[PDB]
Design goal:
Elements lengths: L11 E6 L5 E8 L7 E6 L9 E5 L16 E6 L5 E8 L7 E6 L11 E4 L10 E6 L5 E8 L8 E6 L8 E4 L3
Protein name: MIR domain-containing protein
Keywords: Repeat, Signal
InterPro entries: MIR_dom_sf, MIR_motif
């Protein structure tokens, strides 16, 4: 585990849930409850283009491709196939009423503070070999699998939400898709 296998700005990768093994995912399927924006799920379906995300500097920051990301810093995550950003806000989750909704919103042009996520890793340089959490900057909610699964038209996909506290679905791990 070379101490220099850090995650870099503008790198493209997959986010795997540590305890479930599912990959953070998005698609052209919108919610029919909260904000009605594009949904975000976790899939138990390896290697899929819709599971790739690109790390962007925080909304009011800037970075250079190849730049290491320090723990504690905020980032934005762009869903490659739809050009949207991992987003959160004050809406209720689709299947878990007690939780906050997590969506894929806007684009580089429409991106706002709601797209910022604080990287929670130990030490001070996001390593590709460590587990981490992502805490929504504006609301403070942790990106987590609610433990619920969807039915058709996205059967078996796990619900992704924002939890006030850290749960057994809050730990994530990075992996190089391509």
């Amino acid at each position: 585990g070379s101490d220099e296998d850090f995650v870099t700005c503008y790198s493209v990768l997959k986010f795997i849930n540590a305890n479930d093994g599912s990959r953070l995912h998005s698609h052209d399927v919108k919610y029919g409850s909260g904000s009605g924006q594009q949904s975000v799920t976790a899939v138990k379906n390896s290697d899929d283009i819709n599971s790739h995300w690109q790390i962007f500097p925080a909304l009011n920051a800037k970075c250079n491709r190849g730049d290491a990301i320090k723990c504690g810093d905020k980032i934005r995550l762009k869903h490659l196939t739809t050009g949207t950003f991992l987003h959160s806000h004050h809406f209720t989750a689709p299947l878990s009423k007690q939780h906050q909704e997590v969506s894929a919103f806007g684009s580089e042009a429409e991106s706002d503070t709601g797209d910022d996520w604080t990287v929670i890793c130990n030490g001070d340089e996001w390593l590709e070999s460590e587990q981490f959490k992502l805490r929504h900057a504006v609301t403070g909610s942790y990106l987590s699998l609610s433990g619920q699964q969807f039915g058709r038209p996205i059967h078996g996909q796990r619900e992704v939400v924002g939890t006030d506290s850290i749960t057994g679905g809050s730990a994530w791990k990075v992996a190089e898709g391509i």
